[PDB]
């Protein structure tokens, strides 16, 4: 009754929040895959060094 356009503004704000949160979710997943590849990469690198540590 009193906050009709106010709640419309809230609807817009939550829509923007949904957009930013989707970008966060997506980009964090992207970085998760990135980090996992580089983690397993250097992991196995350490494993090879951990097994046959050169002179």
């Amino acid at each position: 009754n009193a906050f009709e356009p106010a709640f419309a503004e809230l609807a817009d704000a939550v829509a923007d929040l949904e957009a930013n949160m989707m970008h966060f979710q997506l980009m964090h997943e992207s970085l998760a895959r990135f980090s996992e590849s580089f983690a397993s990469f250097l992991y196995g690198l350490n494993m090879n060094a951990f097994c046959v540590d050169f002179p």
Binding site: S40, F41, Y43, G44, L45, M47, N48, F50, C51, V52, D53
Partner: protein, 79 residues
């Protein structure tokens, strides 16, 4: 007789040429020996890089075995 003197002069020139050819053939074979040494060195370098592939190949397989875990001890080899 004098024609034969000229003949022996021709043979002298031929023998000089032959001596130079002999010297050159010996030098050739010497270069082949040196070549073989250098080629051996090349192969040694290639073997070194083969060692490098062995490193990364074991890396890849070791990771894939850990990566493919879809259902131990610490005994390893440390030269």
């Amino acid at each position: 007789s004098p024609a034969l003197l000229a003949r022996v002069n021709e043979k002298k020139a031929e023998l000089e040429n032959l001596k130079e050819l002999r010297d050159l053939s010996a030098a050739v074979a010497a270069q082949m020996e040196a070549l073989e040494q250098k080629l051996s060195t090349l192969s040694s370098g290639t073997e070194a890089i083969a060692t490098v592939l062995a490193n990364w190949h074991n890396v890849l397989r070791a990771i894939s075995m850990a990566s493919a875990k879809i259902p131990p001890q610490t005994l390893v080899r440390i030269p």
